[PDB]
Amino acid sequence: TLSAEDKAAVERSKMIEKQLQKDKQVYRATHRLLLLGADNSGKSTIVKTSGIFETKFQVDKVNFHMFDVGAQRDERRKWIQCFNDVTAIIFVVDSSDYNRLQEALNDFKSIWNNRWLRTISVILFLNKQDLLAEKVLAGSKIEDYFPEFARYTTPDATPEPGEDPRVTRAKYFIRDEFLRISTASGDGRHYCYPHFTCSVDTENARRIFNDCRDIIQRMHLRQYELL
Amino acid sequence: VQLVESGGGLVQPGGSRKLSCSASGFAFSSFGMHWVRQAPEKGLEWVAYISSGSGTIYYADTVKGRFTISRDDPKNTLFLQMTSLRSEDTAMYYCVRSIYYYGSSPFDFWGQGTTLTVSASADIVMTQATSSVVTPGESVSISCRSSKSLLHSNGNTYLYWFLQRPGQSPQLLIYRMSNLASGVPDRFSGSGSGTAFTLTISRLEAEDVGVYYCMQHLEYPLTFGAGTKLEL
Amino acid sequence: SIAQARKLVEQLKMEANIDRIKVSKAAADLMAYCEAHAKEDPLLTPVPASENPFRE
Amino acid sequence: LIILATLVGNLIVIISISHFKQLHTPTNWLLHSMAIVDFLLGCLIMPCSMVRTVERCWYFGEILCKVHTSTDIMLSSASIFHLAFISIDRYCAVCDPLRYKAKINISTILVMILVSWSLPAVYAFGMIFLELNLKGVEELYRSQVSDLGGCSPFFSKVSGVLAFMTSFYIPGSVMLFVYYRIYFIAKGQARSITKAAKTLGIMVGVFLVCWCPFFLCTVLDPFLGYVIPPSLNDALYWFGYLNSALNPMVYAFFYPWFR
Amino acid sequence: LDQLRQEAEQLKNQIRDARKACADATLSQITNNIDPVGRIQMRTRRTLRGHLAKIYAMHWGTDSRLLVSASQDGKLIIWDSYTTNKVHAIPLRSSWVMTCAYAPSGNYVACGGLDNICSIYNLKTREGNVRVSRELAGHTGYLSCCRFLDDNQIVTSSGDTTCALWDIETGQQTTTFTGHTGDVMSLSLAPDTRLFVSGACDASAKLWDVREGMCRQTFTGHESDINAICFFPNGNAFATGSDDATCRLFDLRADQELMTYSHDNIICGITSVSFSKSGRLLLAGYDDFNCNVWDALKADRAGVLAGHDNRVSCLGVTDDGMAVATGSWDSFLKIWN
């Protein structure tokens, strides 16, 4: 910068660096989450062919950013590598169907074993639980879709409502069906945090703060040799 | 992009006035602001300079301490503070925009100014060749001159032409001795290559009448030329 | 589902009829640009640090 | 070996963090400066002390004593002030996990170096030159140490009480209260899902072994009647120098990402 | 409809058979009697810092001095490669950007990503602020690559298995290029701006005619999908990069695959490719933190550009061939020479 005009260029670059430094702090103080599901799973109710949507919620003065993928095709493999920096993945399942449970299970398997989704923990919601009770006390069964339900008994289970034990057995059978895949691999780098979510079930947001708190606390211990 | 000034008037000797130039219609918080004095019977002369980030400030060597500068980003208003007015402190003042990055064109948009009537060194010397001289359709050549090599080691040559028309505020014709402005016709060209410079005009229309000015931006004095009027 | 195998066939009818060249002749015009422009490549020849703008 | 152990490990740290573009993390700049407080210890005060040791005497002149003694003390408390700032950083990470990066950014680290370098520079140089080092015993210094060409520090009552706080106790009770709480948590999580205890075992004993012999015996000695001779007072001195030597090894090495 | 695929396969076999009676001698046979370049020693001359997240794209300006880059923190930056200054800094409406472009004139830039929109920015305005001037909506998948044919024409590549030719003044597609079965991931223009290539995830590369709006030719040979495609200076050849650590050079008139540039010590896939001013060097960015440089005539690996600590996502060689720029996932740009 040996010239008067060159002097003012350096000055402008310095102003640009100041603005970039403010943004870094803001970026540093936010947590990004990815939301996935199906059409039956009412993830939309929990929350112009646009491609992605965003929703913001705040609890205890902490900002969470949730990205829902909109009008994209049926292939997921290649736009999923952009999300290897998120805190967690929220998976929404519609457990009342029975006949289409094979597809949610296989989508869970595909997501959990992904190459770019290592060290990413997943939060599982079992949605519309109240609909299951009305579909099991009346009597479509589960044996005609899952033949191993007749050799399943309720385990540590805590039926907080406690009206029916058959409802509890079916619920926890679905929960175990989902948690069977998690224990097969992952070597303590990412975890699963299920929930039994009713249609409304509005404790969802608090469930997310606690799960994220646990994930981040565990992450550091590994880093310092404590784990 | 339009600017409206305020202030001026006639002030008794020893007074204190706060001159201002007010911006509107653009990103005023990203341009460096100048103030340039025009002698009624002479050429132009620069007085100060304020940067976009309020980090750098220069002043005229003639008047330094008395004059003060200040900018107000939240309202896009510029100010010049004048105190202890002398006999020489009476001329026209123009607020000039300027933005500096690679490929930019400084001194591009001017204001219109105001007047302030007063009652009773080692800097590069830039001079013109003549003062007055044509036919509507012939070619004209105006020669400026410098006293030190305007070419820098980077490769730039800091020389300007303005064409202040007879009645309005100045404009910009050629920036850095070769390049053309935005809304000027493609009939003007800059051809120096030496401490001797020239603005050639191929054709000649009725709007081309006026006085041309010559400036050097290499060092902070920003010494001007003298002026060469063209008469129809 | 008779259109997936119709337009395809129609488009294949045009891709089949194209003139071709000799491969040993293909390694001629690919080289000619290289041999006629090897002296204008700053990356190719290590440039002396006198006429480049990235000296430091 | 201690002079050239403090030197080699420490310089490795200072240089290899700066010339590595990835490790400019706000928290790896503390391993860097803390290191300078300690590398400098070896480079200055540490050698002179070897010279004095081999010869049971000081022969560098009276003026040098006021310097060796006041810089030696400074290069020891500043090296203890960063250990009480590393633990605070670890506690804010493993106890407020969702706020670690917005609470412990580059700006916060910056003052952890200022308050850790400047405060000893005010506390140690205002005691050896303003002569608050000894009061009421001004004649025993020149009868026990100066009667024989010595420069060994002397602490009577108030310099033996205030120099036990703020140098060993205040920054030693912080390192314990934090690593006691980062033990229960590190065990409960591991059971809900040993190592934490092992990790905290080497980061709490080392400091204590290195620094208790000196800040206990040499600073409780006046109450007994100075029963402690010269023979004892050098052995106690060459502990802290060992802390400065082996810290690159712990807080820098012995760690997965540092390599 | 089952009586149609038999003929389709018969015609495909004809095409291959006709192409088979042209490979008289491979390139190695012709090129075995030329002195190689030997070794290239290129070292970092500049380092550009200021991005927060990873960098996915960049594009050199025809001035050979300015360049633009894009990152996921929602930011566009235009640099000055000589003095290392920053000229502009542009924030985006959607933070998931995947591509950026610079106009040949230098008056405009573009970007797009996981929002199904391609935006246009005006660099030369009466007011000193870069503003958005045209949003192109109509694609159903995400935008992968975009290039300016000229100031008023732009060609976009999408994740809905289609390409398009647009018209910025009105904002409506003037042509739709359909036919790819998997999503397109990249594209490259011809120097005469009369043709362009494109690669997709169905391991196929197709040649398109801009004025005709129809497919002209097809190329095959990769085991996996296509990541980045580049085009030879003559206008006759083009080279690409896949996920199986392989790189070819297909001809247009010959309609076949030439000598293949691969090695057995590389397992990861390519992310970006580019060419030199004379076609004597081929450079490609890989996933193993590196950026290999090859001899473009004899398939000799000569030169490695190490210095990044994460995945190399993009490349670029300036117009007059003085320097090279690389972007990466550690958020740093390096200028070599």
Give residue limits of the domains in chain E: 1-336
Q: Domain check: are B25 and B94 in the same one?
A: yes
Provide φ and ψ at E113, rounded to 5°.
-175, -135
Q: Domain check: are B98 and B195 in the same one?
A: no
Do the Cβ atoms of A63 and A56 come closer than 8 Å?
yes
CA atoms of B69 and B78, how far apart (whole Å): 8
Dihedral of alpha carbons D60, D64, D67, D69, sign: positive
Q: Which domain holds residue B57?
A: 1-119
Angle at which helices D174-192 and A204-223 cross, to 10°: 110
Do the Cβ atoms of E66 and E90 come closer than 8 Å?
no
Q: Domain check: are B102 and B147 in the same one?
A: no
Helix (H) or strand (E) holding B53: none
Angle at which helices D195-224 and D230-247 cross, to 10°: 150
Chain A residues with CB under 8 Å of D186 CB are 221, 226-227
Q: Which residues on adjacent β-strands are paired with residue E48?
A: E333
Is residue C49 within 8 angstroms of chain E, CB to CB? no
CA atoms of A78 and A72, how far apart (whole Å): 12
CA atoms of E337 and E330, how far apart (whole Å): 21
Which of D94, D95, D105, D193 is best to mutate for the A interface (most A CBs within 10 A)? D94
Q: Which residues on adjacent β-strands are paired with residue B114?
A: B93
CA atoms of D211 and D79, how far apart (whole Å): 11
Which residue is it, tokens 């007879």?
B166
Sequence-distant (≥ 6) Cβ neighbours of residue B205 within 8 angstroms: B136
Instruction: Note whether residue B15 is domain-resident.
Output: yes
CA atoms of E284 and E300, how far apart (whole Å): 14
Chain E residues with CB under 8 Å of C10 CB are none
Which residue is it, tokens 């400098």?
D40
SS3 state of residue B48 = strand
Sketch the domain layout of chain A as residue ranges: 37-47+75-223
Among residues B91, B119, B147, the one where a domain terminates is B119
Contact at CB, D102 and A227, closer than 8 angstroms = no
- Name the residue of chain A whose CA is nearest to D196's CA: A226
- In order of A6, A8, A17, E21, the CA distances from A2 in angstroms are 7, 11, 21, 65
What domains does chain C contain, in order, with CATH numbers?
2-54 (4.10.260.10)
What domains does chain D contain, in order, with CATH numbers?
3-252 (1.20.1070.10)
Closest CA to E278 of D56, B79, C45: C45
SS3 state of residue E69 = strand
- Tokens in use for E79? 């640099």
CATH label, E1-336, candidates 2.40.50.140, 3.30.70.20, 3.40.50.720, 2.130.10.10: 2.130.10.10
Sequence-distant (≥ 6) Cβ neighbours of residue A24 within 8 angstroms: E52
Helix (H) or strand (E) holding E33: none
Instruction: Count CA within 13 A, CB hemisphere, residue D11.
Output: 7
CA gyration radius, chain B:
18
Instruction: Note whether residue B232 is domain-resident.
Output: no
In angstroms, how far is CA A224 from the centroid of its own chain? 27
Chain A residues with CB under 8 Å of E115 CB are 50-52
CA atoms of B89 and A97, how far apart (whole Å): 89
SS3 breakdown of chain B: % helix, strand, coil, rounded to 5? Answer: 5, 40, 60
Q: Domain check: are B189 and B158 in the same one?
A: yes
Q: Which chains touch C (3 or more CB pairs under 8 A)?
A: E
CA atoms of E267 and E269, how far apart (whole Å): 7
How far is the alpha carbon of D236 from chain A, nearest alpha carbon, in Å?
A: 32
Angle at which helices D174-192 and D195-224 cross, to 10°: 160
Q: Which chains touch D (3 or more CB pairs under 8 A)?
A: A, E
Of E63, E85, E128, the CB nearest to B31: E128
Count of residues making up chain A: 227
Angle at which helices D230-247 and D30-43 cross, to 10°: 140
Angle formed at CA C18 by CA C15 and CA C22, multiple of 5 degrees: 130
- Tokens in use for D232? 């004892």
Q: Which residues on adjacent β-strands are paired with residue B161?
A: B174, B214
CATH label, A37-47+75-223, candidates 3.40.50.2000, 3.40.50.880, 3.40.50.300, 3.40.50.620: 3.40.50.300
CA atoms of D240 and D211, how far apart (whole Å): 6
The domain total for chain B is 2
For β-strands E154-158 and E163-165, DSSP reports them as antiparallel
Is residue E127 within 8 angstroms of chain B, CB to CB? yes
- The B4-6 sheet, strands edge to edge: B4-6, B16-22, B77-83, B68-72
Give the number of other Cβ atoms within 10 Å of residue B149's Cβ. Answer: 11
CA atoms of E261 and B178, how far apart (whole Å): 48
Provide φ and ψ at C10, rounded to 5°.
-60, -45
CA atoms of A227 and B9, how far apart (whole Å): 79
Sequence-distant (≥ 6) Cβ neighbours of residue B174 within 8 angstroms: B159, B160, B161, B180, B181, B188, B189, B190, B199
Angle at which helices D230-247 and D62-81 cross, to 10°: 50
Which residue is it, tokens 């036990």?
D164
How does DSSP classify residue D70? H
CA atoms of E161 and D50, how far apart (whole Å): 77
Chain B residues with CB under 8 Å of A9 CB are 100-102
CA gyration radius, chain D:
20
Q: Strands (DSSP E) along chain D, which ranges? A: none
- In order of A179, D9, D60, E309, E326, the CA distances from D15 in angstroms are 48, 10, 33, 18, 26
Letter for the amino acid at A2? L
Closest CA to B17 of B63, B85, B118: B85
CA atoms of B199 and B189, how far apart (whole Å): 6
Q: Strands (DSSP E) along chain B, which ranges? A: 4-6, 9-10, 16-22, 33-38, 44-50, 57-59, 68-72, 77-83, 92-94, 114-117, 127-128, 140-145, 159-161, 174-175, 179-180, 188-190, 196-201, 210-212, 214-216, 228-230
Chain E residues with CB under 8 Å of D21 CB are 309, 330, 332
Q: Give chain C's count of helices (H) and strands (E).
A: 2, 0
CA atoms of E145 and E199, how far apart (whole Å): 11
Q: Which residues on adjacent β-strands are paired with residue A63?
A: A30, A58
Do the Cβ atoms of A225 and D195 come closer than 8 Å?
yes
Compute the CA torsion angle B181, B185, B188, B190 (nearest 10 deg).
20
Which of D87, D89, D98 is best to mutate for the A interface (most A CBs within 10 A)? D98
Instruction: Count CA within 13 A, CB hemisphere, residue E331.
Output: 16
Point out the annotated binding site of D for 2-phenylethylamine.
Answer: 72
CA atoms of D120 and D78, how far apart (whole Å): 6
Instruction: Note whether residue B14 is domain-resident.
Output: yes
Of A10, A12, A78, the CB nearest to E201: A78
Q: Domain check: are B78 and B148 in the same one?
A: no
Contact at CB, B100 and A12, closer than 8 angstroms = yes
Sequence-distant (≥ 6) Cβ neighbours of residue D26 within 8 angstroms: D104, D105, D106, D108, D109
Do the Cβ atoms of B221 and B124 come closer than 8 Å?
yes
Q: Domain check: are B54 and B152 in the same one?
A: no
Q: Give chain E's count of helices (H) and strands (E).
A: 2, 27
Instruction: Note whether residue B86 is domain-resident.
Output: yes
Angle at which helices D230-247 and D3-18 cross, to 10°: 20
Give the number of other Cβ atoms within 10 Å of residue C17's Cβ. Answer: 8
Q: Strands (DSSP E) along E22-141, which ranges? A: 46-48, 55-60, 66-71, 75-80, 86-91, 97-102, 108-113, 117-122, 131-137
Q: Domain check: are B113 and B4 in the same one?
A: yes
Do the Cβ atoms of D231 and D237 come closer than 8 Å?
no
Among residues B68, B84, B119, the one where a domain terminates is B119
Instruction: Count CA within 13 A, CB hemisphere, residue D122.
Output: 7
CA atoms of E66 and E56, how far apart (whole Å): 18
SS3 state of residue B4 = strand
Q: What is the 3-state secondary structure (H, E, C) of chain A?
A: CCCHHHHHHHHHHHHHHHHHHHHHHHHHCEEEEEEECCCCCCHHHHCCCCCEEEEEEEECCEEEEEEEECCCCCCCCCCCHHHCCCCEEEEEEECCCCCCHHHHHHHHHHHHCCCCCCCCEEEEEEECHHHHHHHHCCCCCCCCCCHHHHHCCCCCCCCCCCCCHHHHHHHHHHHHHHHHHHCCCCCCCCCEECCECCCCCCCHHHHHHHHHHHHHHHHHHHHCCCC
Give the number of other Cβ atoms within 10 Å of residue E191's Cβ. Answer: 11
Letter for the amino acid at B214? C
Q: Which residues on adjacent β-strands are paired with residue E69?
A: E58, E77
- In order of C4, C43, E88, E116, E179, the CA distances from C1 in angstroms are 6, 54, 53, 29, 16
Helix (H) or strand (E) holding D16: helix D3-18
Burial code of E279-311, b = ≥16 C-beta within 10 A, e = fewer? bbbbbbbbbebbbbbbbbbbbeeebebebbeeb
Q: Domain check: are B131 and B96 in the same one?
A: no
- In order of A141, C5, E272, E292, the CA distances from E264 in angstroms are 56, 40, 19, 14
SS3 state of residue E264 = coil
SS3 state of residue C20 = coil
CA atoms of B122 and B141, how far apart (whole Å): 30
Question: Preceding residues of all breaks in chain A (C to N beyond 2.5 angstroms)?
Answer: 47, 139, 155
For β-strands E184-189 and E333-336, DSSP reports them as unpaired
Closest CA to C26 of B9, A27, B117, E25: E25
Chain A residues with CB under 8 Å of D256 CB are 223, 225
Instruction: Count CA within 13 A, CB hemisphere, residue E29.
Output: 9
> Please, which residues 292-331 of chain E have a Cβ atom closer than 8 Å to chain D?
309, 330
CA atoms of A62 and E97, how far apart (whole Å): 26
